Design an enzyme around this catalytic site. Structure first.
Site, PDB file in Angstrom:
ATOM      1  N   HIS A 180       0.530  -1.461   0.207  1.00  0.00           N
ATOM      2  CA  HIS A 180      -0.395  -0.022  -0.121  1.00  0.00           C
ATOM      3  C   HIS A 180       0.833   1.004  -0.028  1.00  0.00           C
ATOM      4  CE1 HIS A 180      -3.239  -2.768   0.512  1.00  0.00           C
ATOM      5  NE2 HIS A 180      -3.283  -3.136   1.068  1.00  0.00           N
TER       6      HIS A 180
ATOM      7  N   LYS B 132      -4.946  -9.929  -7.780  1.00  0.00           N
ATOM      8  CA  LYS B 132      -6.132  -8.842  -6.658  1.00  0.00           C
ATOM      9  C   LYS B 132      -6.461  -7.940  -7.242  1.00  0.00           C
ATOM     10  CE  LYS B 132      -4.738  -6.716  -2.560  1.00  0.00           C
ATOM     11  NZ  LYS B 132      -5.386  -5.398  -1.604  1.00  0.00           N
TER      12      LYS B 132
ATOM     13  N   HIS C 196      -2.731  -3.514   8.568  1.00  0.00           N
ATOM     14  CA  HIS C 196      -3.572  -3.584   7.291  1.00  0.00           C
ATOM     15  C   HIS C 196      -4.471  -2.353   6.491  1.00  0.00           C
ATOM     16  CE1 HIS C 196      -7.167  -5.675   5.249  1.00  0.00           C
ATOM     17  NE2 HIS C 196      -8.104  -5.622   6.248  1.00  0.00           N
ATOM     18  N   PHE C 197      -4.577  -2.693   5.471  1.00  0.00           N
ATOM     19  CA  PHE C 197      -5.244  -0.768   4.622  1.00  0.00           C
ATOM     20  C   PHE C 197      -6.609  -1.798   4.947  1.00  0.00           C
ATOM     21  CE2 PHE C 197      -7.002   1.742   2.245  1.00  0.00           C
ATOM     22  CZ  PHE C 197      -6.776   2.714   1.886  1.00  0.00           C
ATOM     23  N   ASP C 198      -7.626  -0.422   5.773  1.00  0.00           N
ATOM     24  CA  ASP C 198      -8.785  -1.642   6.280  1.00  0.00           C
ATOM     25  C   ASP C 198     -10.255  -1.072   5.014  1.00  0.00           C
ATOM     26  OD1 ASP C 198     -10.596  -2.939   8.639  1.00  0.00           O
ATOM     27  OD2 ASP C 198     -11.854  -1.480   8.221  1.00  0.00           O
TER      28      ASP C 198
END
Length: 124
Positions: A12, A41, A119-121
């Site tokens: 990210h 992805k 984590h990229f939420d």
């Protein structure tokens, strides 16, 4: 092994450029960050801010994670980001993406010591 924090950065982070002023941006970045190795992805977000500024979000607004956990934080400000999603014709192994630039508040899951993004939420 690759740490959760390192994975977040590879998947990210893109401070190296202020934006994605190219339709080829996602195709190149999704590929180089290995997001097209065993599968395409579907969608992925790259954040165009310094790693330090993104890490600072971990002490900003505590908000619920998508999974209901308590370690997610939303940025007070909107951040420059690039949303990469497969084109209609994209089919592994020939992954192809559409690049969309945007500015949104980001929500990241944080963990550890130092307490950093793992984590990229979501971006809201």
């Amino acid at each position: 092994k690759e740490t959760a924090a390192a994975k977040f950065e590879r998947q990210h982070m893109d401070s190296s450029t202020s934006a994605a002023s190219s339709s080829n941006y996602c195709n190149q970045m999704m590929k180089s960050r290995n997001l097209t190795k065993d599968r395409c992805k579907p969608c992925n977000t790259f954040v165009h801010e310094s790693l330090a500024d993104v890490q600072a979000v971990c002490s900003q607004k505590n908000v619920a994670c998508k999974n209901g956990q308590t370690n997610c934080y939303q940025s007070y400000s909107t951040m420059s980001i690039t949303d990469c999603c497969e084109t209609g014709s994209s089919k592994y192994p020939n992954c192809a993406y559409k690049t969309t630039q945007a500015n949104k508040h980001i929500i990241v899951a944080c963990e550890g010591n130092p307490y950093v993004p793992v984590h990229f939420d979501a971006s809201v």
